Amino acid sequence: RREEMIAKIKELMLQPERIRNIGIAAHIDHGKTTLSDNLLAGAGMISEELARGITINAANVSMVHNYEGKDYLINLIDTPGHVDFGGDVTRAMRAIDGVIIVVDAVEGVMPQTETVVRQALREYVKPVLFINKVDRLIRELKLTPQQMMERFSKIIMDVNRLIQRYAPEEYKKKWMVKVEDGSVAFGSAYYNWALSVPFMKRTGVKFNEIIDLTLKGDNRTLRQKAPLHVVVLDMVVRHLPSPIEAQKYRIPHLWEGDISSDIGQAMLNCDPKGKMVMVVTKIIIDKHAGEVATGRVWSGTVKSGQEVYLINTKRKARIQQVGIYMGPERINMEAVPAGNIVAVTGLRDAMAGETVAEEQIEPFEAL
């Protein structure tokens, strides 16, 4: 039901501890797009009452996920795929608080894997690990359960070596990933299943059941018994931070202004009562709506009709319509508080990376 989901989005956007702003990153062909598309589909966000390629270069897609009796609003924000480095990559890392690092079970950790882990960690983005294509270990390589667990262990050790080496000093140990606490999951994005220790504890489901169904070709039972979106989004909710948790340590890194100032404090503490500061992540031109700027609200509350400064472009402006994402769709909202990803009209002169603020402040980017 559409009206129900819209109400749910409004409910959760008002509670910053229920939000997760994330991205997904991977070496080429390891499964970023398949995971992205199938999480969105599995969470039921593109059902007719409300798949391949829908997330490709999508500014944001949101998913509502229930975890231990509470609903969460997960924003899967665009991160550039298949590129080594660039301003676009850095900018997208700065927009997300958590990242799912996807590693192919066959190739393992590859040079581009190391690059994306580095790039995320450099901006205080907390990682979790999803080991993909486990169907290939089962069917094509015909590995034993012990051989597969040993393969996972090696991947995990390689990832943690990168975290130890590249995480900000304070998080070199804290952000290591482990199978035991479910900050690692493994599965097949393509066949819509995954497992983790917390999921297996909760349900009693065992890897051998998944192996059996896989070899039998019972793909319907497979994806229902160990759903990709349940296992992976459970991991997102438990282990990736809310914007209010993340901004307390991310904002001094991200913004070069005076953290002790009122606006600095409002961003540090994700305060919806402070002056509004947002950063534009992406702009598209819609034939009907005109320029639509997607962005993250760091502080304050963004409103339809709100007068703002475009800091990099050096102009005063007025936001026309504010929107928020429901799956891939923009839905109108007249006011949206800090912590959220929004889409706004009225800022045609803005560029990607633009700092948009109620007061003249230091920009997040030199632009």
Ligand SMILES: Nc1nc2c(ncn2[C@@H]2O[C@H](COP(=O)(O)OP(=O)(O)O)[C@@H](O)[C@H]2O)c(=O)[nH]1
């Ligand atoms: N066997 C298998 N193939 C997969 C899986 N996930 C993705 N693929 C395939 O691997 C290729 C690359 O996937 P894609 O999601 O586009 O990778 P990306 O480049 O990281 O975005 C495509 O042919 C996918 O269908 C998986 O779990 N198992």
